Write a protein that binds this ligand. Structure first.
Ligand SMILES: [Mg+2]
Ligand SMILES: [Mg+2]
Ligand SMILES: [Mg+2]
Ligand SMILES: [Mg+2]
Ligand SMILES: [Mg+2]
Ligand SMILES: [Mg+2]
Ligand SMILES: [Mg+2]
Ligand SMILES: [Mg+2]
Ligand SMILES: [Mg+2]
Ligand SMILES: [Mg+2]
Ligand SMILES: [Mg+2]
Ligand SMILES: [Mg+2]
Ligand SMILES: [Mg+2]
Ligand SMILES: [Mg+2]
Ligand SMILES: [Mg+2]
Ligand SMILES: [Mg+2]
Lengths: 113, 215, 177, 192, 126, 63
RNA sequence: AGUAGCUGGUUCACAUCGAAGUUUCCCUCAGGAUAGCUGGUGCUUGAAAAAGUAUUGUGCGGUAAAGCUUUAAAUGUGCAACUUGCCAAAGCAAGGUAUUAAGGCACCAAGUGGGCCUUCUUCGGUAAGCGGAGCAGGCGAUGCGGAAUGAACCGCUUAGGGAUAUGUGGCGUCAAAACUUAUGGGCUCACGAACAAUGGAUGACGCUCAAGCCCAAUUAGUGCCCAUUAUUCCUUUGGUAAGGGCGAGAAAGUGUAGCCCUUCCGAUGUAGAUGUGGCGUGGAGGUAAGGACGAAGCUGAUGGCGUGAGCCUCAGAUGGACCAGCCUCUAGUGCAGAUCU
RNA sequence: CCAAAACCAGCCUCUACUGAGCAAGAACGAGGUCAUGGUUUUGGCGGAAAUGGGGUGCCCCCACCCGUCUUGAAACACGGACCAAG
């Protein structure tokens, strides 16, 4: 159960198409956001850190671990209830056939099988 | 071996805490019956009784930490009144009565009742331990803090911070200053003196009411 | 409501010394909200009169004083007070009340309105019960007659709170709120 | 909502981990971190913290200065008491000015090839902190020492020179450049 | 705009009323071993060796006795530090301290409330 | 402009450091010299008897 | 590519701390240097030389008041807790056998060096939202809650949240709360509710046995509402904090997806300083791996992860051939703003 | 998965003196609560359901354009149309 589910967006990203939504800390004395007036956007801080034993845990309940080939699956053989292999985006559909019928045989989870 | 010697101690300590607080209960019931006889003697004698002066005030910081002057700001630190509704028991030396007089607008205080002392020490009581602020929970906790054959019970503490103690400093200093909640039902005016219809300053025995809503 | 001001009699003295080995004790009637203020007003007069001060004295008795009874009676309160507009008006107003405490607190509200006079500007100078006739003041004299009857005219009778209502049917007391 | 005035000023700055990249310091901190925690000994707590210091603050010691400080220590020892091990958390350097030294048993992070040979020419052992832990797991008659750092030429520069009390060394590639007439100079001495 | 050595000493170095005149023999026969506490209370009748002004009334220990002068170490708050000053002073300007006379008396000696039966008791009313 | 505002605040940040203890920089030097010179003659003799004392303690410790 | 003490700009995040507008000096006054303030690094050891506070003892003072230029406050302020000279001489001298709180020291370095307001005290000025100082506190650099509104007033100062309770301020509507409470007192008929000209301001309405004023109150002679505050709970982060431990895990560990658990205290922040098994970019030494079963790139109500910079996955009914990871090296490395090109 | 109830713990709320009063102390009893901990129980839902995210709208509420030099910027002060590459 996350502290904040919203992104901490950059101030006024919505007005300027070029600005990425990605966070930049506001600066300028007069910044409404760094002066942290109440009606303004929030800034990220240590206090929004997620609970630390639920951290990094995907709703499946697994921590994702990158996988590239069939050998990686054995890195997850003994901790298959803790880690879930997420096959890399660029492995071929060829190789993924091999990772997948083997990630099945081993009882290891895969996020994108 | 030690495993059970921890029992011989934990059993011996409540045997002591029983023995202690049996004395303190008697030392209260007796001390006050004796203090009723005299004021009652005197009324028969057509005669007044100068009650012994308070030897302990339960000072309570009552204004917040903003805009406070360097002299008041130091006295509050030496009282260990560093937050708002912090509380400490300070005994009423002239030198203290002159510290309290220097920061009264920042504090409410008076002369705690034995009951007020119990509630703070039992409910809000926290020992300093290895610099840790440690909630009182065991008499074991107290005897370890106070390496003092005198101070073993939580009843030892309440007597010290009420009777005025020979260890009133040894005791009250080993307590973290009390972190009371704001008085339920509110204050009156943290700006005026109590006799002005406000809050700050000495309010004598009445502090027990004010401080009761807080504890 | 019950009186604003409790009736304290604070007794105290300058604390004993080789300067004054057997100091006078001073009784002092006060009308205070509570003893801590009565004790305070008592030390106000100790320095304003006896030159003794709170640090150097010691109240011997803060005790409140018991009411004379409860029968309606008649009080001559003698009340000095202060203002920039008036620096010390001696003033024996009379009040009709059940108690010295009630006549006095009644004299503070009266005095606070006709004179923007705070509690600590005022000082009571005495509160005799008076017999019917001695009251020169004409206002309370109306109430002396053993045969006095008056109407409770043009009442606003608010309902008991449990029964109060925002909307009611007009010639009824059906609630509609 | 708290007075904090004067709290931050009381914060101390201490090393809690070595900046040394050297693997052996880290096996050596691994030891005495353990040994300092698991023993009641104050010696392990000193060897462990000194071991965390800068090589600046781990000044080298002359073997000359060990032989002095050691015999000066050991000469008083009651007969049949073998002399303390001479531990230093730093390098031990040979001293030409003391050709012959006592059979010392020095223990240090590092030894000069000269110190190590003179140390063994006297028949003394030149043991490391590894077997220091294995022979004196506690600082039992170890004689922990430090090398000097006041005579270090960096500190000769501390302060100003121009300020009257001072005998700071001015920074100068040119020794003759800031030379000055006796008249024009800062007063040498000055009371604090 | 004009702070010479004795700026603003119109009152400070004034002799007290009907207490004018150079220091007496009790002054002259006082003697100062080093480490003695002293009071640098400047006396105007004596002008040689007069303390600056800041040092007037300051206490400090003697660190030095020359034939007519008493060196005194007197702390001065300069800024964030108390610099420890060394004023030189003619002995007239140094009144020996009693600042420790209580404490010396101590190691010399190291070597509630009840019924008040009082009967007079006027009423306090105005 | 010459306001002294924020100065005692800025000064009490690191406190008014209290003055050095008398046992430290207790140099004489500019002390009335004739006393100062006799003091050297004694201190130098304290040194010869301090060293002579330690020579005694060792010879005593050879037993 | 003249120079510019001037103007403008100077690109990731987070965490840790965090100012100064004053001193001396300068052809100095829009700038330096200097010291202070601040950071970092330590060092040193742990009621060391602790203290913006009292008490007690001992000095200092000449302002207010007084007085007719003299007595004298309060607030303050200091302080304390054998050998070798002198003497006439061996005796003197000198050196030797209350509360609270971790103390001190060093190094390097920044920013700053326009301040402003207010409190009280003043000085100058006829007066000022005026010039100048002293004191302290603030704003600057800081919100939040309140005063309708307000840089500095009031309260309170600040990690992400919940309960509780408050502070200043309120409780007729607006607006949470007296569904217009009092089983309180007076006063009031026309206005009334801290710091001459666009029509229009107790904030608005409206209120008048008040919804005004003074006073007191809290269910009544038998209270309630609202804070970034307090307390408590959960979580985070920091601690160069305190301990314990060493079905899957149990690493001797600064720092990671932290070796694990426990407890405690802290958390704002401009300039600035620092940290970061912090993010991210082009390249290199390595390692490991991927790709025509589709690399990079690009698109994306593709979700997922991370406080965040960001990463990852999904989907392209995109592309067409390169390339991510990890440790080390490197730099022409991160952009809404320069009247930028 | 949504619910609801229970239990335990926690937590919270709700005589004495005096001359009818207080400056006054507990007790019994009961309630509340999981955005407190541990104990399940019981039902509801189950090509879909369910929780989460995302999108769009609304509602109530909060909310002065940013950068800038400046004591002070929302300023009737300067710079600012958009985007890409730099
Ligand atoms: Mg209030
Ligand atoms: Mg105020
Ligand atoms: Mg040297
Ligand atoms: Mg004078
Ligand atoms: Mg200037
Ligand atoms: Mg901070
Ligand atoms: Mg400029
Ligand atoms: Mg005068
Ligand atoms: Mg005058
Ligand atoms: Mg507001
Ligand atoms: Mg409402
Ligand atoms: Mg911060
Ligand atoms: Mg390049
Ligand atoms: Mg879109
Ligand atoms: Mg570039
Ligand atoms: Mg301007």
């Amino acid at each position: 159960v996350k502290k904040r589910t919203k992104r901490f967006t950059r101030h006024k990203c919505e007005l300027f198409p070029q600005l990425s939504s990605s966070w930049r800390k506001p600066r300028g004395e007069d910044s409404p956001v760094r002066r942290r007036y109440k009606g303004q956007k929030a800034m990220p801080n240590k206090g929004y850190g997620s609970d630390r034993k639920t951290k990094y845990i995907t709703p499946s309940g697994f921590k994702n671990f990158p996988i590239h080939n069939v050998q990686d699956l054995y890195m997850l053989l003994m901790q298959n209830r803790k880690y879930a292999g997420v096959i890399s985006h660029t492995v071929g559909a060829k190789s993924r056939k091999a990772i997948v019928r083997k990630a099945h045989e081993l009882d290891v989870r895969l996020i994108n099988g | 071996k030690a495993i059970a010697a921890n029992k011989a101690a934990r059993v011996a300590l409540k045997k002591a805490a029983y023995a202690r607080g049996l004395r303190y209960s008697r030392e209260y019931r007796s001390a006050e019956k004796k203090l009723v006889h005299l004021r009652r003697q005197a009324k028969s004698c057509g005669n007044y009784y100068l009650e012994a002066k308070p030897k302990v005030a339960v000072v309570t910081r009552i204004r917040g930490i903003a805009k406070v002057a360097p002299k008041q700001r130091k006295i509050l630190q030496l009282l260990r009144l560093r937050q708002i509704f912090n509380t400490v028991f300070v005994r009423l030396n002239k030198p203290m009565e002159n510290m309290l007089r220097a920061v009264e607008p920042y504090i409410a205080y008076g002369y705690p009742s034995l009951r007020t002392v119990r509630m703070m020490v039992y409910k809000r009581g926290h020992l300093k331990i290895n610099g840790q602020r440690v909630k009182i929970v065991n008499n074991q906790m107290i005897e370890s803090k106070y390496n003092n054959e005198n101070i073993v019970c939580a009843e030892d503490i309440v007597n010290q911070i009420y009777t005025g103690g020979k260890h009133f400093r040894e005791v009250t200093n080993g307590l973290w200053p009390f972190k009371l909640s704001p008085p339920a039902g509110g204050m009156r005016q943290k700006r005026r003196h109590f006799v002005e219809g406000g809050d700050y300053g000495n309010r004598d025995a009445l502090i027990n009411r004010f401080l009761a809503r807080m504890i | 409501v019950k009186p604003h001001l409790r009736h304290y009699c604070v007794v105290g003295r300058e604390t004993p010394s080789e300067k004054n080995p057997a100091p006078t004790v001073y009784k002092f009637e006060v009308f205070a909200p509570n003893f801590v203020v009565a004790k305070s007003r008592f030390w106000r007069m100790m320095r304003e009169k006896n030159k003794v001060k709170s640090t150097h004295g010691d109240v011997l008795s803060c005790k409140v004083v018991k009411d004379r009874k409860l029968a309606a009676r008649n009080y001559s309160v003698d009340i000095a007070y202060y203002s920039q507009r008036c620096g010390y008006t001696h003033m024996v107003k009379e009040f009709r009340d059940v108690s010295k405490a009630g006549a006095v607190s009644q004299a503070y509200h009266d005095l606070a309105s006709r004179h923007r006079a705070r509690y600590h500007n005022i000082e009571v100078l005495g509160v005799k019960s008076i017999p019917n006739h001695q009251v020169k003041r004409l206002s309370i004299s109306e109430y002396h007659a053993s045969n006095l009857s008056f109407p409770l005219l043009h009442r606003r009778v608010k309902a008991p709170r449990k029964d109060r209502v925002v909307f009611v049917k007009k010639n009824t007391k059906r609630a509609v709120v | 909502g708290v007075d904090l005035t004067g709290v931050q000023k009381k914060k101390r700055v201490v090393r809690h981990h070595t900046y040394s990249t050297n693997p052996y310091i880290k096996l050596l901190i691994k030891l005495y971190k353990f040994l300092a925690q698991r023993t009641n000994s104050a010696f392990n707590k000193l060897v462990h913290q000194r071991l965390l210091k800068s090589r600046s603050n781990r000044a080298p010691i002359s073997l000359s200065r060990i032989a002095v400080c050691m015999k000066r220590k050991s000469v008083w020892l009651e007969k049949g008491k073998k002399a303390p091990i001479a531990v230093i958390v730093g390098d031990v350097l040979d001293d030409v000015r003391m050709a012959r030294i006592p059979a010392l048993r020095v223990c240090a992070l590092r030894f000069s090839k000269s110190a190590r040979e003179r140390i063994t020419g006297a028949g003394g052992e030149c043991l490391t902190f590894d077997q220091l832990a294995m022979v004196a797991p506690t600082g039992k008659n170890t004689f922990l020492l430090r090398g000097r750092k006041s005579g270090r030429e960096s500190v000769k520069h501390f302060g100003a020179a121009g300020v009257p009390g001072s005998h700071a060394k001015p920074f100068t590639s040119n020794r003759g450049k800031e030379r000055q007439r006796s008249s024009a100079r800062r007063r040498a001495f000055r009371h604090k | 705009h004009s702070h010479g050595y004795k700026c603003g000493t119109r009152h400070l170095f004034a002799k007290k009323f009907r207490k004018h005149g150079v220091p007496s023999v009790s002054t002259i026969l006082t003697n100062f071993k080093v480490g003695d506490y002293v009071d640098v209370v400047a006396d105007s009748a004596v002008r040689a060796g007069m303390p600056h002004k800041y040092y007037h009334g300051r206490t400090g220990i003697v660190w030095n006795v020359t034939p007519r002068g008493v060196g005194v170490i007197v702390n001065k708050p300069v800024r964030n530090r108390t610099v420890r000053k060394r004023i030189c002073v003619r002995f007239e300007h140094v009144r020996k301290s009693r600042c420790q006379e209580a404490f010396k008396q101590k190691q010399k000696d190291f070597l509630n409330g009840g019924i008040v039966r009082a009967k007079r008791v006027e009423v306090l009313a105005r | 402009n010459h306001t002294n505002h924020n100065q005692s605040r800025k000064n009490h940040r690191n406190g008014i450091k209290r003055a050095l203890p008398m046992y430290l920089h207790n140099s004489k030097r500019g002390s009335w010299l004739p006393a100062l010179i006799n003091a050297r003659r004694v201190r130098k003799n304290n040194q010869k008897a301090a060293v002579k004392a330690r020579r005694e303690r060792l010879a005593a410790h050879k037993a």
